């Protein structure tokens, strides 16, 4: 409630908020106002919001100095670049003048176009069904452990995102694209109701962006169709994805009978070298498992060939199996541990990969018929 919005703020109080709330913006222009940030002044607070219609990011900035309430929207990139370009310590005075938003500091003056705050989209009202609070580092671990396995544009649209699931005292993430799957769970120190929602892939990426890893805790609220995350002075809200996500419990290989264990770095570097001579599009490599040995081979349409032999721990029947080497490298890069375990069955069945020393995360990769 106010027609003459005005505030004055220190530059260093604005810069990180402006960067954060601009996260959802970018890409194809559609509705003009989506390239703008909503500014609202009231009762000691400046709020800044950016949206792409599917998600929204809000920052709150405490206002010390005399301010007058109101709201407008201004071009996000230009406003950020102006503030960032002012000198360290600058005081930034902002005020609406007619249909222009003025930004003043020193003898620098910028008159920006605006679009009406009344036109700025809102996410529909909704009610929270579960709420819990956890360290940022825990949420970062959960997402980093799994996010590479989300689909991008699968027709199975429930795959273009990440399952967040509460069970007992644990929060779990699951991501799969039909060809590989990642699951990770972490205790969060409170008894939770059971709930399973799919966060869109772009919202996963934005939630990750808001975690600086510091000690401001993450508060999560989940509704039937939305998720909200509060960290520090920021509030992120996203729509959820419809559909029945796959049950990871039924995707984990049943009773794999062949157990190989190898050094993570040695395995990763061998796959990385072999990948060089794999087909650029299909990426297939062949694994041959024999007593205490793994052989990896790759070839390409030019008939070039890579071969790597590694000493490993394996007792069991010999077998051969093909994989997309990118999927294997993605898992090994996410494990970052000393020894890996691969659990195999046969050449046409998935394999489970995990840290030999931890069960918090598990990975499943479906083979290729080479």
């Amino acid at each position: 409630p106010g027609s003459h919005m005005k505030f004055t703020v220190e530059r260093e109080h604005l810069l990180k908020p402006l960067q954060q709330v601009s996260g959802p913006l970018g890409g194809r222009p559609t509705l003009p106002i989506l390239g703008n940030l909503l500014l609202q002044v009231a009762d000691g607070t400046l709020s800044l919001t950016g949206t792409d219609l599917e998600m929204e990011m809000v920052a709150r900035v405490a206002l010390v100095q005399p301010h007058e309430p109101g709201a407008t929207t201004v071009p996000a990139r230009k406003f950020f670049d102006i503030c960032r370009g002012l000198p360290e310590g600058a005081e930034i005075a902002v005020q609406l003048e007619g249909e222009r938003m003025l930004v003043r500091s020193g003898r620098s003056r910028f008159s920006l176009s605006t679009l009406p705050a009344a036109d700025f989209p809102n996410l529909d009202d909704w009610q929270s069904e579960v709420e819990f609070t956890l360290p940022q580092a825990t949420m970062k671990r959960l997402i980093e452990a799994t996010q590479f396995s989300m689909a991008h544009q699968d027709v199975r649209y429930y795959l273009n995102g990440m399952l967040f699931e509460t069970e007992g005292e644990e929060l779990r993430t699951v991501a799969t694209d039909g060809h590989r799957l990642a699951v990770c769970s972490m205790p969060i120190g409170q008894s939770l109701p059971s709930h399973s929602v799919i966060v869109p892939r772009k919202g996963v990426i934005e939630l990750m962006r808001m975690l600086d890893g510091g000690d401001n805790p993450l508060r999560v609220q989940i509704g039937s169709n939305n998720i909200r995350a509060h960290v520090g002075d920021f509030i992120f809200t996203s729509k959820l994805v419809d559909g029945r996500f796959p049950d990871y419990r039924r995707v984990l290989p049943k009773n794999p009978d062949k157990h190989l264990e190898a050094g993570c770095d040695l395995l990763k570097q061998a796959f990385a070298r072999a990948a060089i001579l794999s087909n650029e599009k299909f990426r297939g490599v062949r694994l041959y498992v024999s007593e205490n040995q793994l052989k990896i081979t790759a070839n390409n349409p030019e008939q070039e060939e890579a071969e790597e032999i590694l000493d490993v721990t394996y007792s069991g029947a010999e077998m051969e199996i093909g994989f997309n080497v990118s999927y294997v490298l993605d898992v090994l890069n996410a494990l970052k541990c000393e020894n890996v375990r691969m659990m195999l069955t046969d050449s046409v069945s998935s394999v489970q990969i995990e840290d030999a020393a931890s069960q918090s995360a598990a990975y499943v990769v479906m083979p290729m018929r080479l």
Partner: peptide, 5 residues
């Protein structure tokens, strides 16, 4: 490439 489901 095979699928998990």
């Amino acid at each position: 490439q095979a699928x998990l489901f």
